Amino acid sequence: KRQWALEDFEIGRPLGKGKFGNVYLAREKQSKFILALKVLFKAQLEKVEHQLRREVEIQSHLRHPNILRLYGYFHDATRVYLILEYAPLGTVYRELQKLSKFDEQRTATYITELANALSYCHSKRVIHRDIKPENLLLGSAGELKIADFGLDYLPPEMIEGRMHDEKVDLWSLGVLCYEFLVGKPPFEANTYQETYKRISRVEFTFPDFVTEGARDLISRLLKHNPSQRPMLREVLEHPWITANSSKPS
Numbered sequence: 001k002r003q004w005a006l007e008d009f010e011i012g013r014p015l016g017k018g019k020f021g022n023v024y025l026a027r028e029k030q031s032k033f034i035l036a037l038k039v040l041f042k043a044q045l046e047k048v049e050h051q052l053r054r055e056v057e058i059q060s061h062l063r064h065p066n067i068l069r070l071y072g073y074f075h076d077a078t079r080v081y082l083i084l085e086y087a088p089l090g091t092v093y094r095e096l097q098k099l100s101k102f103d104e105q106r107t108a109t110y111i112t113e114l115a116n117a118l119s120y121c122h123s124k125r126v127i128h129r130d131i132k133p134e135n136l137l138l139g140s141a142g143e144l145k146i147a148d149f150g151l152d153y154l155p156p157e158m159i160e161g162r163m164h165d166e167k168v169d170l171w172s173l174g175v176l177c178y179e180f181l182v183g184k185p186p187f188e189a190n191t192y193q194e195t196y197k198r199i200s201r202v203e204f205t206f207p208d209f210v211t212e213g214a215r216d217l218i219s220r221l222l223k224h225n226p227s228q229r230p231m232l233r234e235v236l237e238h239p240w241i242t243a244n245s246s247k248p249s
């Protein structure tokens, strides 16, 4: 067990706001490494608690270069502090907004890193990650980090009130692959009710610039019947992925 204290850190700029408190860039005073210090107000946190609890637990046991690291935690009487990895390149969402859409190389690379992280997650029994672009951070090398962390992306089984399994993550990967290449998720519409229908019927169109290999991959992942979706290893072996990914799996 390691005891941390506020005094061990040099607090820097705020990196953002969570529904429960702020996140700051911070430097640990001895090592000088740089990290994110997330603050959660004990009070409104019971407005629940002991979950997050599950959360620090889960994130603490996950050790992967494509999953945001939790280095430790400490607390006082209105605050709990999470010592988190700092992702210097920001969010993938920011990158998508700036470029409007990603090329095949960038997309296939991100999908490789995500499939690897998801495969590791599943190997540790963790499933159903929210991998929307705003929840994906970028490390120093431009490598993606799943930053889960205590409707467009919901699979049919979910919106149709059935039970779901790890196959929900494959559906997410397909929606993500489409959003990366196109700049918007595939079932986007005006009203939630119209989006629910699109998802339920797997109703979406491809822009002309989406290639043959990309369509094959996306269409397989976005199968209504979860058992018909490819396994993560089949995604990593898909020819469109092995042609375009700038990194091995």
Ligand SMILES: CCOC(=O)c1[nH]cc2c1N=C1CCCC(O)=C1[C@H]2c1ccc(Sc2nc3ccccc3[nH]2)o1
Binding pocket: 015, 016, 017, 018, 023, 036, 038, 052, 053, 055, 056, 059, 068, 070, 082, 084, 085, 086, 087, 088, 089, 090, 091, 137, 138, 147, 148, 149, 150
């Ligand atoms: C790209 C720059 O941002 C970061 O590097 C970074 N590192 C950690 C975070 C973060 N940038 C932001 C933006 C503002 C909202 C928020 O919470 C964070 C924070 C973060 C997002 C997700 C997690 S992991 C985590 N959060 C938890 C909450 C409760 C219990 C366990 C948790 N693990 O930490």
